[PDB]
Design a protein around this ligand. Structure first.
Ligand code: SF4
Ligand code: SF4
Ligand code: FES
Ligand SMILES: [K+]
Ligand SMILES: [Zn+2]
Lengths: 114, 125, 688, 48, 95, 86, 206
């Protein structure tokens, strides 16, 4: 159970990187909305950033956290340098996807999947 | 310099799989049954992991079998059930494990075909 | 101590005396090529594909038949062994027809594969080939006998496993022909297994002919529900369609065989299917509607009734998940009239003690018994694979079998004591001589058929049989923890329903006719509208429109056993689960989900939303129901036998007559097989 | 073909057709297999 | 052997035809249902039975290596003819 | 509103169910004669901790653990249920 | 024998001798050395030894493997360390090739070999992209072959052949959009393996 670390030696060090990444993303949204001429608001973009971070709040492995931060930095680089096009940024929002029903009855009516 | 990690290995967040195809799937870990049409046993050596079968429907244009299940063809191979279970656990799939069925040792005797007083005597060869 | 040392290519292996050379090789993972040898048949030694060199011996030995001697070094890969295999393969293919493209065996053919692995890569046969005329042995097995390689596997299977001596060889030499000589049909409940054991495409499935190739099929390991044996199967599917059923080896149940009903009734799943919800219209006719509408009508009636006014009947193919969902739903309106179609006497302990209604010895235990007493049953047609296990013990252990009931042909010779139920009393009292056989037996086995319990004096028969089983056990004539009393079931859903606390039979419904009736795949016709009030609201949930559906007010299309992952408990009390091979057709839905959806619409939502959650519920009611493949022993036969005596019923004078006296009765017994055109062809074949 | 005529066959088109795409004679694909599952037809008379 | 249905749609040699309420026949509106009218089942039936003087005959479909794999057909039964499994030609042992 | 069904779960061999096994061997028959039309579903399964389930009207359920109970405590738990009406 | 590939014993012996030579000089890192029947030499090493072993083979006077022919990964899910990292090297001085192999899992970084071979830059970016193996101290590690924002590592054995998402132009939003994959015809899985063993020489012990 002794392993080679990526960047962080423990969760406290790992969570510092997470906070630093969040600040970078938070400040980048207004530029992204303007640069990509998005029809979403700056608040929506920041609400989406928070949602992406929040879904990984249960991780307790510092190596997994490091990879998530590493991948998050790559995604931020693709956005700042405008390697992404508008389609790539807007894929986070699933605009053309119909609302998937959640409750048991709705899923029962449409098909067999749980 | 190494560090100490006690968390159960969980990589679900860094594999890119959509959440639906982790939580709602049931992996089946098993050794495939011998195809009864043949006597060869070489296809029963390894452990397999497959996922639950989902809807296939008829394509309106051609009648071809359409699917919306991205794991419909995924079948993984493992040396042992422990390797298969470990792979399933770290990927967040719930699983069922079926113990390997091995044909039991049989007692064969060509001479029994001609028994003097037992029912094993054969009427034809 | 007893084991002797031999060598397989220099690797030492310790084997028991009598082990053949072929078995010694398989101990180190080497499969010797074979054609005539089959480990479940008697040794033949005729194909010669298994010839192998023994070091320092000039002559190759037939590994399948030759007993291994101490100190032998078996060279499974020597040049002499390889040349022997090449030569034999060359002879096998010399007269074989160039049929692979049109032959259904192609792609899963042992001749093809062993030719690739062990034979040469070309021909030097410059002559013309043999051609043989085809035989007609019925509507299930197609014969293209020019492909036969005279391995005699089919002959040995028919004689030893099926107990039918109709197949043989006629003529001599190159003209030797496998067949029946006369025009004659090989109609046995195990006949279809010769398709599997025939190594070539000489014997092929007629219904399957030309429809698929092996490489393109998907294999779904599943369980059979055509009877209560619980045979393990493989469902072959392609592009969303079921294509055939194959045996799946299970040593403790079906070995590698299945009955013809298990094998060929699947085509009933493509006919007469319920694909949409239906409700009656103003004209009184069933008409398609949405799930929302159909369930709202059912929920409306359910909310207006309580207690004895709601009842349910489960049919023979219903799974445990649906069985407990329906029980929970009716319990939430305070109903306890959860009934099955198959009767079981509730007198005494009833279903309180599992040992009362189980095959306690287990299927594999028959191979340990030294006497079997069959009462009021025809196991050949009620449980073909169980009957095959009796024959196996009869053949190899010299088992003694006695029967009380009609003198049906069982494929082996037995002692017929008569069909009068009074014989049980005579045996129990020591008057009958066969009671002396039971006393001197170290491992007796008494098996009462569930079909006998469908009589009106079922409780008396069960009491009398239990009295016999108790006389032996109390007399210490048996050994340690050997169970003597057995019940042989014939309905797939019965044991799970008894485990869950259902009431066996529809007597409760006849006592208090309900106003609302749930027919959960109930197609036996045990309760008709003549037995219900004029305005009774009947809901049929099932997969086939057969008997129950045309009298219901609401039809809810459910899933067949090939279309759901559902739990069935075989006659031993072993829980097994199917897997989804294809999804239910049309708008049909998983049966437990229908009841869970109905509960929500009716305001009594059940506390489980997934298959695993409803299986956790099954564990609350009966922990054994989630121990898949395990046989949980049942005890307390002594307490059950005490409760069996305190109330006395009288045997009727009617002799014990099983519902299936001949093969014609075997083919259609449930709604899937009644819908199968293949089974209709079988029925026509044996009656005409 | 005036020196080496093709082999005559009963089934060979006697009238060659050029590319028919874009016209009413164009090919339209469709499934050539029959229906696989037969639905139960409820009785035409009343009895509930 | 082209036959038509009550709706008028041609029936293919595999028996395919859209039933009356099938929306899918909208694809043929303004276009056409491609149907091959040389039904192989009717064409092979027109071939005469070949009389031979032996119990066993071989068929390769004609044309040597341009035909099908060579198979041997047994002609011992007198109730029916021997049919090639590849090409459908029929044979009969004379006298 | 009262009782509808009793279920007893136990292991065939674990010592924790020894008291339940004694109860069945010695008391179930007498208990069954007193409550003839009450389902008392005994269901043995290997390596389960023993338990007593009671189902009342309209599908309400309660479960009492019998682990390491003596045959007497099993009787007491049985009586506590045969007179309760949850 | 016209149809059989001829053996080359001389090259087999030379490569075997050099394989021991490497193992003797770097015992700290070498775990296994083998020469295949078609005369290819493989050095299996602990992952800590990537830089020392590759540097030795590049620079040592009796090696001079100056050319990195290829660098790739293999996913073997049954292994605790599922990823096998393969370096294929060429020595022009001695007209020879050698293969260096190590291993890692999904969370353990491998040391970037760009300092030893500048060729490694893009190969390691491709390994990261397709397999998700992280290389430490890479000058610029990021996806190279997949779409921007692509989720997952396609060359892993548990990644489905057709992926999870597919693209189309949607007129309502006037752009290309990504949606869950649906196929008009499902890929048809074939079961090809014969139930009969083909190669006795490679049989595994029971
Ligand atoms: S039995 Fe096997 S070898 Fe013979 S024609 Fe059929 S596929 Fe070919
Ligand atoms: S028909 Fe098949 S099983 Fe019977 S002898 Fe011929 S090859 Fe063997
Ligand atoms: S397998 Fe031994 S002679 Fe046939
Ligand atoms: K066969
Ligand atoms: Zn021909």
């Amino acid at each position: 159970t002794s392993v080679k670390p990526i960047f962080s030696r423990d969760m406290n060090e790992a969570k510092r990187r997470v906070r630093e990444l969040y600040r970078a993303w938070y400040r980048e949204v207004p530029n992204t909305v303007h640069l990509f001429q998005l029809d979403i608001s700056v608040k929506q973009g920041r609400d989406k950033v928070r949602e992406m971070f929040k879904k990984n709040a249960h991780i307790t492995d510092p190596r997994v956290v490091d990879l998530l931060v590493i991948k998050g930095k790559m995604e931020l680089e693709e956005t700042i340098k405008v390697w992404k096009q508008r389609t790539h940024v807007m894929r986070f929002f699933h605009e053309t996807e119909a609302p998937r029903p959640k409750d048991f009855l709705s899923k029962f009516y449409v098909g067999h999947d749980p | 310099q190494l560090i100490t990690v006690d968390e159960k290995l969980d990589i679900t967040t860094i594999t890119g799989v959509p959440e639906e195809h982790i939580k709602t799937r049931k992996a089946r870990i098993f050794v495939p049954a011998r195809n009864n049409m043949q006597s060869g046993v070489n296809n029963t050596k390894k452990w397999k992991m497959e996922f639950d079968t989902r809807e296939r429907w008829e394509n309106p244009l051609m009648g071809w079998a359409s699917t919306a299940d991205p794991l419909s063809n995924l079948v993984l191979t493992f040396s042992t059930k422990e390797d298969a279970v470990a792979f399933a656990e770290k990927n967040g799939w719930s699983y069922d494990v079926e113990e390997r069925k091995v044909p039991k040792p049989k007692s064969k005797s060509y001479g029994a075909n001609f028994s003097w007083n037992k029912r094993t005597r054969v009427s034809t060869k | 101590s007893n084991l002797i040392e031999v060598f397989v290519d220099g690797q030492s292996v310790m084997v028991e005396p009598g082990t053949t050379v072929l078995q010694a090789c398989e101990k180190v993972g080497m499969q010797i090529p074979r054609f005539c040898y089959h480990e479940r048949l008697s040794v033949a030694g005729n194909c010669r594909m298994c010839l192998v060199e023994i070091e320092k011996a000039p002559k190759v030995v037939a590994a399948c038949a030759m007993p291994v001697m101490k100190g032998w070094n078996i060279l499974t890969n020597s040049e002499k062994t390889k040349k022997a295999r090449e030569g034999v393969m060359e002879f096998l293919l010399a007269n074989h027809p160039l049929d692979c493209p049109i032959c259904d065996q192609g792609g899963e053919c042992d001749l093809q594969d062993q030719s690739m692995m062990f034979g040469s890569d070309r021909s030097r046969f410059l002559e013309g080939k043999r051609a043989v005329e085809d035989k007609n042995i019925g509507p299930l097995v197609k014969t293209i006998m020019t492909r036969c390689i005279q391995c005699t596997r089919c002959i040995r299977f028919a004689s030893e496993i099926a107990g039918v001596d109709d197949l043989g060889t006629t003529g001599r030499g190159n003209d030797m022909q496998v067949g029946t000589y006369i025009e004659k049909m090989f109609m046995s409940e195990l006949s279809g297994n010769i398709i599997d054991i025939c190594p070539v495409g000489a014997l092929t499935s007629k219904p399957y002919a030309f429809t698929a190739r092996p490489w393109e099929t998907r294999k779904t390991e599943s369980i059979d529900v055509m009877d209560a044996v619980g045979s393990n199967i493989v469902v072959s599917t392609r592009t969303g369609e079921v294509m055939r059923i194959l045996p799946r080896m299970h040593e403790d149940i079906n070995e590698e065989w299945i009955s013809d009903k298990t094998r060929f009734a699947y085509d009933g799943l493509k006919r007469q299917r319920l694909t949409e919800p239906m409700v009656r219209n103003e004209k009184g006719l069933l008409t398609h509607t949405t799930w929302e509408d159909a369930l709202s009508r059912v929920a409306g009636m359910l909310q207006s009734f309580q207690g004895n006014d709601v009842a349910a009947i489960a049919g023979g193919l219903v799974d445990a998940e649906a069985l407990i969902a329906l029980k929970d739903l009716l319990n939430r309106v305070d109903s306890d009239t959860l009934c099955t179609e198959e009767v079981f006497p509730t007198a005494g302990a009833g279903t309180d003690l599992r040992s009362n209604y189980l095959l306690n010895t287990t299927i594999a235990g028959v191979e340990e018994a030294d006497v079997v007493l069959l009462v009021g049953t025809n196991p050949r047609f009620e449980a073909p694979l169980f009957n095959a296990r009796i024959r196996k013990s009869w053949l190899h252990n010299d088992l003694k079998v006695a029967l009380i009931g009609s003198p049906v042909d069982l494929t082996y010779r037995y002692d017929h004591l008569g069909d009068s139920p009074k014989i049980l009393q005579d045996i129990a009292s020591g008057s009958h001589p066969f009671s002396q056989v039971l006393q001197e037996a170290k491992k007796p086995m008494v098996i009462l058929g569930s079909s006998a319990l469908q009589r009106n004096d079922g409780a008396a028969i069960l009491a009398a049989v239990s009295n016999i089983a108790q006389k032996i056990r109390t007399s210490s004539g048996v050994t340690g923890d050997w169970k003597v009393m057995n019940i042989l079931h014939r309905i797939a859903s019965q044991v799970a329903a008894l485990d869950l606390g259902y009431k066996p039979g529809v007597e409760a419904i006849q006592k208090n006719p309900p106003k609302m009736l749930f027919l959960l795949g109930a197609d036996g016709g045990c309760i008709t509208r003549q037995d219900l009030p004029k305005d009774c609201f009947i809901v049929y949930q099932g997969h086939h429109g057969d008997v129950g559906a045309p009298i219901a007010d609401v039809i809810l299309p459910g899933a067949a056993y090939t279309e759901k992952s559902a739990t069935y408990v075989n006659t031993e009390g072993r829980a097994q689960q199917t897997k989804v091979a294809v999804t239910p057709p049309g708008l049909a839905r998983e049966d437990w989900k229908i009841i869970r959806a109905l509960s929500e619409i009716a305001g009594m939502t059940l506390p489980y939303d997934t298959l695993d959650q409803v299986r956790n519920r099954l564990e609350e009611v009966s922990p054994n129901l989630v121990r898949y493949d395990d046989v949980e022993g049942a005890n307390y036969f002594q307490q059950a036998s005490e409760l069996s005596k305190l109330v006395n019923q009288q045997l009727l004078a009617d002799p014990l007559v099983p519902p299936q006296l001949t093969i014609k009765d075997f083919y259609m017994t449930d709604s899937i097989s009644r819908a199968s055109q293949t089974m209709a062809k079988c029925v026509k074949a044996v009656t005409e | 073909p005036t020196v080496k005529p093709p082999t005559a066959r009963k089934f060979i088109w006697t009238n060659h057709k050029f590319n028919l795409s874009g016209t009413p004679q164009q090919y339209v694909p469709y499934s050539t297999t029959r229906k696989k599952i037969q639905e139960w037809v409820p009785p035409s008379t009343p009895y509930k | 052997g082209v036959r038509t249905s009550p709706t008028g749609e041609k029936v293919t040699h595999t028996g395919q035809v859209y039933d009356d309420g099938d929306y899918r026949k909208v694809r043929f509106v303004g276009r056409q249902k491609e149907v091959n009218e040389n039904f192989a089942i009717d064409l092979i039936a027109e071939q005469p039975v070949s009389q031979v003087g032996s119990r066993v005959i071989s068929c390769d479909g004609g044309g040597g290596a341009l035909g099908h794999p060579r198979v041997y057909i047994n002609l011992d039964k007198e109730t029916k003819t021997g049919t090639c499994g590849y090409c459908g030609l029929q044979f009969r042992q004379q006298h | 509103l009262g009782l509808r069904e009793i279920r007893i779960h136990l292991c065939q061999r674990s010592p924790g169910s020894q008291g339940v096994r004694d109860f069945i061997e010695k008391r179930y028959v007498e208990l069954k004669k007193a409550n003839p039309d009450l389902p008392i579903l005994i269901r043995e399964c290997s390596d389960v901790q023993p338990k007593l389930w009671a189902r009342y009207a309209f599908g309400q359920e309660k479960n009492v653990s019998l682990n390491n109970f003596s045959a007497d405590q099993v009787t007491r738990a049985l009586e506590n249920v045969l007179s309760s009406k949850a | 024998r016209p149809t059989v590939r001829p053996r080359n014993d001389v090259a087999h012996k030379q490569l075997s001798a050099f394989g021991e030579y490497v193992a003797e000089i770097l015992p700290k890192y070498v775990q296994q050395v083998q020469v295949s029947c078609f005369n290819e030499l493989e050095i299996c090493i602990h992952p800590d030894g990537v830089i020392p072993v590759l540097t030795f083979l590049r620079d040592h006077s009796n090696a001079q493997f100056k050319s990195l022919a290829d660098l790739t990964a293999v996913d073997i899910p049954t292994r605790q360390n599922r990823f096998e990292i393969v370096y294929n090297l060429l020595s022009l001085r001695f007209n020879s090739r050698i293969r260096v192999k190590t291993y890692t899992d999904e969370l353990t970084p491998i040391e970037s070999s760009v300092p030893v071979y500048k060729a490694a830059n893009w190969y390691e970016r491709e390994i990261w992209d397709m397999f998700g193996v992280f290389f430490a101290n890479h000058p610029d590690l990021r996806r190279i072959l997949t779409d921007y924002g692509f989720e997952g590592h396609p060359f892993r054995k548990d990644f489905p052949l057709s992926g999870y998402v597919e693209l189309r132009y949607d007129d309502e939003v006037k752009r290309v959009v990504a949606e869950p994959v649906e196929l008009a015809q499902e890929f048809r899985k074939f079961d090809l393996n014969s139930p009969w063993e083909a190669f006795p020489a490679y049989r595994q012990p029971p």
